[PDB]
Design a protein around this ligand. Structure first.
Ligand code: OLC
Ligand code: NA
Length: 385
């Protein structure tokens, strides 16, 4: 009808699905937020808002949308660059970009476009993806070392590598490695590794408690409030639209590619242009409330489905579990150390870089490598300096 496929069977499936997808979203929404440079709060609220509305208004019932880790990476550059231009409205501006990219998605969908962003070749997707993975890893380079990220970032960071060398925090590195370890080697499929890693890492600051280490600090309790546009007449503004153009585009490609995975596991098919409209709305709303930009998650989505999610009620439920978790359990986050999140973010990076493809045309091999290099260069560029 006017919304995504919602019906009142799969109450059990949709409930187990939403709640599994909420606990998965939680460690990486914290991670992506911090990494973003916007609050940890910006990460969560995107996860709720993009999640909810895209679930309410899209065309893929099983689909779990959220700040996705090529959304985070792109968005993180944008924010950096817009703060460097205007430290008083940079963030705000960036949220306005999230909104604008929302709008773009709405249009690409409203305009018989969703169809042919499927025409992307694997080699390109794979280059982009391994490209984004590398960046994410290097961002965590600095959190791993136990000092905060420099302003490059990653040019700032690589610039700052030298005596970032010996200002080290050994316990933090130890903490970060420990986290990676927890995720990497637990055979012994619920108790998802990331939530396990997250929880143990915190509490293992009953071993390393006497030491000082960085944690997510306290943070805005409870409800979020409307930040309408600063579009700002900027010398920025021309830069904002190119930014909204990429972000919107990227968010469709990521939302869609997954929606194909959603198709696979379910024997169902889905509606692209409606999905893009769902993504648009979810993003517009997220920006309107300081959330990050999102798209369809594919870690979030498969786990929802295996739990047995079958209806957009999965999504709705997910976003509301999250919602109460944020507004009631805000105090817990504050003790979660940054190293643990770095570790988590690190492996997400590691996990999205494509390496089988490493170790079949001589063309593709090359295209990929270039797309990789191209994708780190533009990233490095987009951050002012
Ligand atoms: C020539 C012009 C330069 C081109 C440069 C830009 C390339 C285009 C961006 C592609 C977006 C691909 C997004 C793919 C995200 C889907 C990821 C996915 O479906 O699976 C994730 C999994 O975790 C991973 O192993
Ligand atoms: Na995805």
């Amino acid at each position: 009808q006017i919304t995504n496929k919602i019906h009142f069977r799969n109450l059990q499936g949709d409930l187990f699905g939403g709640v599994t997808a909420a606990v998965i979203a939680l460690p990486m929404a914290l991670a992506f937020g911090i990494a973003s440079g916007a609050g940890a709060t910006a990460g969560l609220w995107g996860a709720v808002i993009v999640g909810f509305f895209a679930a309410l208004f899209g065309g893929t019932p099983t689909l779990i949308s959220e700040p996705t880790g090529p959304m985070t990476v792109v968005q993180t550059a944008v924010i950096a660059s817009l703060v460097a231009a205007d430290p008083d409205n940079g963030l705000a501006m960036a949220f306005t970009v999230v909104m604008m990219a929302g709008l773009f998605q709405i249009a690409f969908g409203l305009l018989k476009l969703g169809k042919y962003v499927t025409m992307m070749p694997y080699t390109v997707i794979s280059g982009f993806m391994s490209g984004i993975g590398i960046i994410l890893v290097i961002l965590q380079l600095a959190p791993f070392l136990g000092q905060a990220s420099p302003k490059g970032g990653v040019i700032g960071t690589l610039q700052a590598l030298p005596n970032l060398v010996s200002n080290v925090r050994p316990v933090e590195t130890l903490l970060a490695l420990m986290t990676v370890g927890i995720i990497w080697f637990m055979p012994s499929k619920f108790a998802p590794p990331q939530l396990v890693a997250l929880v143990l890492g915190t509490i293992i600051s009953i071993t390393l408690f006497g030491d000082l280490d960085i944690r997510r600090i306290g943070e805005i309790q409870a409800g979020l409030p409307a930040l309408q546009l600063p579009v700002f007449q900027a010398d920025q503004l021309q830069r904002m639209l190119i930014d909204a153009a990429v972000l919107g585009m990227l968010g469709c490609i990521d939302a869609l590619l997954t929606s194909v995975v959603a198709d696979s596991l379910t024997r169902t098919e889905h509606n692209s242009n409606k999905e893009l409209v769902g993504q648009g709305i979810g993003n517009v709303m997220s920006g309107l409330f300081g959330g990050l930009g999102g798209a369809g998650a594919t870690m979030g989505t498969v786990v929802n489905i295996q739990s047995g999610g079958r209806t957009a009620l999965s999504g709705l439920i997910r976003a509301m579990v999250l919602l109460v978790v944020i507004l009631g359990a805000a105090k817990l986050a504050a003790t979660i150390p940054l190293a643990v999140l770095a570790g988590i973010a690190f492996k997400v990076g590691v996990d999205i870089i494509d390496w089988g493809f490493l170790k079949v045309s001589i063309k593709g091999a090359l295209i990929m490598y270039a797309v990789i290099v191209l994708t780190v260069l533009v990233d490095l560029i987009a951050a002012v300096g």
